[PDB]
Amino acid sequence: SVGLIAPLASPINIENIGDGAEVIKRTEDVSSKKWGVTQNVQFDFVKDKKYNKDALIVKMQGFINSRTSFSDVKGSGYELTKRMIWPFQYNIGLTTKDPNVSLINYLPKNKIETTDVGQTLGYNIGGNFQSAPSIGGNGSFNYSKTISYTQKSYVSEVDKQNSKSVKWGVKANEFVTPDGKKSAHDRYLFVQSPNGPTGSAREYFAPDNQLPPLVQSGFNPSFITTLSHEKGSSDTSEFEISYGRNLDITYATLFPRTGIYAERKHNAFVNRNFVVRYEVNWKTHEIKVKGHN
Ligand SMILES: NC(=O)CN(CC(=O)O)CC(=O)O
């Protein structure tokens, strides 16, 4: 054994990650007021003399407002019918738009149903990427990036994962209510009788203190994918990052002397996403937003 006479772990913007390698860190913050989305993206170029390919670790963060709304339904005969529009699923995806780039890793890589999601992408010099479905107490990497998000009552699925694109869906699953657990497909999910016959639209639905954050507020994504570039090919590549929602409609009609009658319009508005196009310049190690927003 020779663990005692090993080299030092640390023998010695842009971060030096070891001999002949550095990470050039770029960021883009693109928001849409109309979409209620903020894409806060980190783009880390792995510049390594011992890795025959250029690599870009893309960490997708930011915010997707739930856009949950509670409204009157206009029209005679609908005075006692109210509508709640809410996100059944949050969509996060990255699609490559040029043949000279491919995706070589994705986090989360598998479906995850825990309330807390915390994972790590590690990089070791010479092109070695590794992933762990946990944070802390992992191996020894030259560089690492983590993802962290909470999805109470929702589950994360890999909807699509290939050399050109990755799509995750953070989908409604099971909710705690004062009347017991309810499935995301229960048509009575979130409805309630208002306090009186003149009760506002908001009163026909579960109060804020009963709605989990992905329904009441929104989602704070935290996802990773690494783009691989075959050297010799074009210095530039384009790709799109999409953040959005699939919305359901819940209708609640009050029959004052009887109670509530509920209806669900499932998948009422699908793939309602904010798409941003970016261009990687592998030569200058730069990112620019195409068209912007
Ligand atoms: N915007 C679209 O065309 C996509 N979707 C829209 C939606 O269902 O909300 C329908 C489809 O094309 O199947």
Coordinates of C-alpha atoms and ligand atoms in Angstrom, one line a residue, residues 267-272, ligand 1:
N267 CA -54.3 18.7 -20.2
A268 CA -56.3 21.8 -21.1
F269 CA -53.2 23.8 -22.2
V270 CA -50.1 21.7 -23.0
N271 CA -46.5 22.6 -23.7
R272 CA -47.0 26.2 -22.9
Ligands
LIG1 N1 -49.5 24.2 -29.6 C1 -49.7 23.0 -30.1 O1 -50.1 22.8 -31.3 C2 -49.5 21.8 -29.2 N2 -50.7 21.3 -28.5 C3 -51.4 22.4 -27.8 C4 -52.2 22.0 -26.6 O2 -52.8 20.8 -26.7 O3 -52.4 22.8 -25.7 C5 -51.6 20.5 -29.3 C6 -50.9 19.6 -30.3 O4 -50.4 20.1 -31.3 O5 -51.2 18.3 -30.2

